[PDB]
Amino acid sequence: MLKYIIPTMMLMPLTWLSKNSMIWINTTLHSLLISLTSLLLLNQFGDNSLNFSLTFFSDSLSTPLLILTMWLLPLMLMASQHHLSKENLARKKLFISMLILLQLFLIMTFTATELIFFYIMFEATLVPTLIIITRWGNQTERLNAGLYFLFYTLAGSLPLLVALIYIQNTMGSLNFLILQYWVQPMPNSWSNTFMWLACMMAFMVKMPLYGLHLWLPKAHVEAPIAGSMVLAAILLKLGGYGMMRITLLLNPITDFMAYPFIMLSLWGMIMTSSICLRQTDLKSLIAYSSVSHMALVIVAILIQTPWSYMGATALMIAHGLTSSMLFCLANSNYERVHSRTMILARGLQTLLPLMAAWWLLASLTNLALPPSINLIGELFVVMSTFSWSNITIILMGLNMVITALYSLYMLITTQRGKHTHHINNILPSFTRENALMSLHMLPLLLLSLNPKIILGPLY
Amino acid sequence: PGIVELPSLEDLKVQEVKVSSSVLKAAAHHYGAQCDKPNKEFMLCRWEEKDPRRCLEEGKLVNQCALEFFRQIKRHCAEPFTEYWTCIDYSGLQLFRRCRKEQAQFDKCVLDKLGWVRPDLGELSKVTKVKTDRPLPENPYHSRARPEPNPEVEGDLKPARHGSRLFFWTM
Ligand SMILES: CCCCCCCCCCCCCCCCCC(=O)OC[C@H](COP(=O)([O-])OC[C@H](O)COP(=O)([O-])OC[C@H](COC(=O)CCCCCCCCCCCCCCCCC)OC(=O)CCCCCCCCCCCCCCCCC)OC(=O)CCCCCCCCCCCCCCCCC
Ligand SMILES: CCCCCCCCCCCCCCCCCC(=O)OC[C@H](COP(=O)([O-])OC[C@H](O)COP(=O)([O-])OC[C@H](COC(=O)CCCCCCCCCCCCCCCCC)OC(=O)CCCCCCCCCCCCCCCCC)OC(=O)CCCCCCCCCCCCCCCCC
C-alpha cells in the first residue's frame, strides 16, 4: 500500500512548496492522479485477498472504501476552496494538510492487516477531523460539537483498546489473516458479553447507532464542507468496516447479542427518517438521513448473512457518494443565502435549473431509485432481513416510504414553489459547483453498470 | 528444634585460680612467657571450634598450667612478688609505671632463681603457630547444604526472531 501512502505523504511538500495562487490546482491535480492510481487495488481474487505485506492487505471490502477515500480528497479541495478564499495562506495550507493527513490515516486504516494498527489509525482519524471542525467551522457550536465528536468516539473506543489487547494476549496475534484461521467460538458468558460490547460499541458510535447518534447532527452540521464530506462519506464507514472485520471473532455470541441493537436500528431508521420530515436545518436533515441509512448497515452486519454484507458494503459506498453530494448541494445554497434554513430560499429551479437537476438526481439516488447502487444495497439488506424475520419488511417498507418523503420534500422546499422575494443574491451556478456535482453523481451512476466491484468480499 | 547439649557440673569442676586481678597483672608477662603453649592451644581451639563445650579439657590445662606457674612463684619468690603486686594493687588503674623498682626486684629474683626472662615490648602480642593433634573442624558453623545457583547464560547471541514482535512492528 506504500505506492499509495508515499504519494499521499508527498502531497505535504506539494502543498507547502507551491506558489500562493497554485496550492489548490496542484493538490487537486495530484490527488486526482492518486485517485486514478487507486484502481490498481481492483486486483481481487475469488479465493484470496490482495495481501501486500505483513502490515497491509486489501480484500474487496476495503478496495471500494479506498477508491472512495482517494476520490473524495479532490472533491473536498474543490468544495472547500471558495469559502477559504479570503483565508490566510498558511492557514489555508494547514487546512489542506489536515485533509491530506486525514486521507493518509484513512488509507492505512482500511488496509491495516493487524487490528491494533487498525485501532491506532482509526483513532488517529479523530485529530484532523476534530481540528477541521473546531477551527474552520462557521458557527459558535463547533467547539461543543467537537467535544461531542471526540468524547463519544473515545468513550466507545478505549474499551475496544483493552478488548483488542486481550485478543492479542489470548490468541497470540491480531493479524486478520491469522484470525481467519485461528478464530475460536465465543461461548455464552458475561465475560464474553462485555467482550462483545467492548468490540462493538466503538463502531456503533462510528456508524452511528441510534441513541448514540447525538454527536452527528452537531459534528456534521458545525463543520466546513470538506469536514461534512469526509465525515458522512468515509468516517461513518469506519464503523461498518470495523464491524465487518470484528464480527469474525464474535461468534456465536453475536447471534443473540445483536437482538437489542437490531431493534435500536430497526426502530431507529423509522425515527430518524421521520425526524427528516420535520427538520428546518437542511444540513441537519442530511445528517439525520445519514443516521437512517447507516441503521440499515448496522442491521445487515448484525444479521451476518452474505446478502446482508453485500448490500451493506454497496449501501455504504452509495451513501458515501449520495450524502457527500447532498452536503455539497446544501453548501451551494449556503454560499449564496448564508443560512442553512431550508424554508428560507425556495423555488430555486426558477433560478438555477441545472443545479435543480443535480438536486433531483441526488434526491432520486437518496430515495433508492433503481438501478442505482443505493437501491442495490437497500434491496439486498431488505432481502436478507426478510430472511432474518418475515415481519421486518414492514419496518423496511415504511422506512422506504419515509425515505421517499423527506427526499422529495427537500426537493420541493428548496427547489419548487414560488421563490423568496427578498433574496436577490442568487448567483448563477459556478463551473466549480456543477463540476463537483458531476464528480459526485457520474461515478455513482456509472457504478450501476458494473456493481460487482462495490459488493464486497463475498460477491 | 533439638535439645541443647550442656556438659555436666562434674565436667566443669577444676581447681580455680583464686587470686585477684593485681596478682594476675603483676605476674602477667612471665605468665605469657612461661604458660605459652597450653594457653595458645586453648585459644586456637577456642577460635576454631567456636564452642566452649568443645574446649573444656584444654581450658582445664590452662587452669592446670596457671597454678603450676604460681606455686613455682610461691616456692621461690613469694616476698618480691607480694611486695610487687601490693604496689600494683594500690593504683586505681593498676599502673606498671608506678611500680618499676618492685618490678625490678621481682624480675631479679625470678631471673636468678628460675631463669625466666620477662618478655620485651612487642613479644606477647605476636601471632604464633600452634601444633595440635585435634582435627580441624570441617563445618565449624554447622552450616547445612547451600542452594544450587541459577543456570548461567551460555550460547552465542542470535538476533531476535522477527524483531520486537510488538503488535505490528517488523523490526
Ligand atoms: C461506460 C460508458 C457509459 C456510457 C453511457 C452513460 C451511462 C449513464 C451515465 C450518466 C448519464 C446521465 C448524465 C446526465 C445527467 C446529469 C446532468 C444533467 O442533468 O444534464 C442535463 C443535460 C441536458 O439538459 P439541459 O436542457 O441542457 O439542462 C438541464 C435542465 O436545466 C434541467 O434538467 P432536466 O431536469 O430537464 O433533465 C434531467 C433529467 C431528469 O430525469 C430524471 O430525473 C428521471 C430519471 C429517473 C427515471 C428514468 C430512469 C429510470 C432507470 C432506467 C434507466 C437505466 C436502465 C435502462 C436499461 C433497461 C432497464 C434495465 O435527467 C435526464 O435527462 C438524464 C437521463 C438519464 C437519467 C439516469 C437515471 C438517473 C436517476 C437516478 C438514479 C437511478 C438509477 C441510475 C442507473 C444508471 C445506469 C447507467 O444533459 C447534458 O448536458 C448531458 C451532459 C453529458 C452527460 C455524460 C454522461 C456520461 C458521463 C460519464 C463519463 C465517463 C464515462 C464515459 C461515458 C460518456 C458517455 C457520453
Ligand atoms: C547498498 C546499500 C544501501 C541500500 C539502500 C536501500 C534503500 C534505498 C532507498 C533509501 C530509502 C529507504 C527508506 C526506508 C525503507 C522503506 C521504509 C518504508 O517505507 O516502510 C513502510 C512502512 C511499513 O510498510 P510495509 O509495506 O509493511 O513495509 C515495506 C518495507 O518492507 C519496509 O521495510 P521494513 O519492513 O524493514 O521496515 C521496518 C519497519 C516497518 O514498519 C513496521 O514494522 C510497522 C510500523 C511502522 C510505524 C507505524 C506507526 C503508526 C502510528 C504513527 C503514525 C504516524 C503518522 C503517519 C505519517 C503522518 C505524516 C508525517 O519500519 C519501522 O517500523 C519504522 C517506522 C516507519 C519509518 C519508515 C521510514 C521513514 C523515513 C522517512 C520519514 C519521512 C516521514 C514519514 C512519515 C512519518 C511516519 C513514519 O509503512 C508504514 O509504516 C506506513 C507509513 C509510511 C512510512 C514512511 C515511508 C518512507 C518514505 C517516505 C517518503 C515521503 C516523505 C514525505 C514528506 C514527509 C512526510 C509528510
Ligand SMILES: CCCCCCCCCCCCCCCCCC(=O)OC[C@H](COP(=O)([O-])OCC[N+](C)(C)C)OC(=O)CCCCCCCCCCCCCCCCC
Ligand atoms: C459509547 C459509550 C459506552 C461504551 C461501551 C463500551 C462497551 C461496554 C462494556 C465495557 C466493559 C469494559 C471493557 C470490557 C473488556 C472485555 C475484555 C475481556 O477480557 O473481557 C473478559 C473479562 C473476563 O476476565 P478474564 O478473561 O481475565 O478471566 C479469565 C476467564 N474466565 C472468565 C473464564 C475466568 O472481563 C472482565 O474482566 C470484565 C469485563 C467487564 C468490565 C466492567 C468494567 C467497566 C464498566 C463499564 C464501562 C462502560 C464504558 C465507560 C464509558 C462510558 C461513557 C463515559
